[PDB]
Amino acid sequence: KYTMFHYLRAQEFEHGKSRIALTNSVNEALLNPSRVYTFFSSDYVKKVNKATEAAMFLGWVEQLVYDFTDETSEVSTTDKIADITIIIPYIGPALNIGNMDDFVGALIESGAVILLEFIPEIAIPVLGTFALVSYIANKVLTVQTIDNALSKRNEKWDEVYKYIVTNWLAKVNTQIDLIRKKMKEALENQAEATKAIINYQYNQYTEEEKNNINFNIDDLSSKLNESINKAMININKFLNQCSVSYLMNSMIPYGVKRLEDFDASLKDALLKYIYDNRGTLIGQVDRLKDKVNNTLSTDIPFQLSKYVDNQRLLSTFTEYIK
């Protein structure tokens, strides 16, 4: 029915003489150049649509800015979700994300996946051990032979991580960044549409009446800009949490299962290689055995900081590690 870009158009209007009115019905917003969509509360809708006496005008303005900031800075902190501690509930209603009708519900059941319009390729192919099997095949056993095999194994873990993180960088964050980029738009639209409904009423006030109080829209718009900045802070925090969440719970584990399988196979190989050739050490190979056993028994730690210099992403990842 409605893509993200339609909701974002429901939230626009052409400058005109008419009084424009916010509405919670998306369909209604689109079919009328006067009606504008909002993800704000029905209480907020009512409060702006209602026509306002000249006396109660500045007091009106006060409440809307309070209501704006209340609605915008909304923050749920339900901690039923893994590695997402903050939610911004109005995101879905604003961009048709969690309506793709309970958002926060949607995150709790399905995780951060629900932000992606396009699910990336998650499967990691089987990692074979043929290259190393061939490498040691009729090689006289030495310390360096075993150490090479093990550096190669390290390198493999490094390759799979790089693969996964890059997939994530390219296909996931770009998508999420789009939500961020667009959320800023939706919020800025709502500011422009409220500034419009207000400055409409004020320009129906008689000049002697109007002359009494000065509109000072550069004050208003400005106060609306700071309320948004505060909202983007919540949104960004949230988004980066979701990013690292998806990465660590829904992407990296697939690599790690495969890498573990790889270590395992390599282990068998090398230990057999060492026993088959123990006679080069007059039969005493206990150290070499212990080396491959220790090395391959522990996963190579994943450091997001290899790939990313971002402040937000790395701290979110730091929080992940405990």
Numbering used by the authors: 547 to 646, 650 to 871
Give the article text.
Interestingly, diffraction-quality crystals of tHNA could only be obtained at an acidic pH despite thorough crystallization screens at various pH. We suspected that the isolated tHNA domain may be prone to adopting the acidic pH conformation needed for LC translocation, and its neutral pH conformation could be stabilized by LC/A and/or HCA. Taking advantage of our new crystal structure, we set out to look for point mutations on tHNA that shift the structural equilibrium of tHNA more towards the neutral pH conformation as opposed to the acidic pH conformation. After extensive search and screening, we found that tHNA carrying a single point mutation of F658E could be crystallized at pH 8.5 and we determined its structure at 3.02 Å. This result is consistent with our structural analysis that suggested F658E may destabilize the acidic pH conformation, but does not directly affect the neutral pH conformation. We found that the structure of tHNAF658E is highly similar to the corresponding region in full-length BoNT/A that was crystallized at a neutral pH (root-mean-square deviation of ~0.96 Å). Notably, the BoNT-switch adopts an almost identical structure in tHNAF658E and the full-length toxin. Taken together, the structures of tHNA at pH 5.1 and tHNAF658E at pH 8.5 allow us to directly visualize how the environmental pH regulates the conformation of the BoNT-switch. BoNT/A1F658E has a ~5-fold decreased toxicity, which is likely due to the energetic costs of burying of an acidic residue in a hydrophobic pocket when tHNA transits into the acidic-pH conformation during LC translocation.
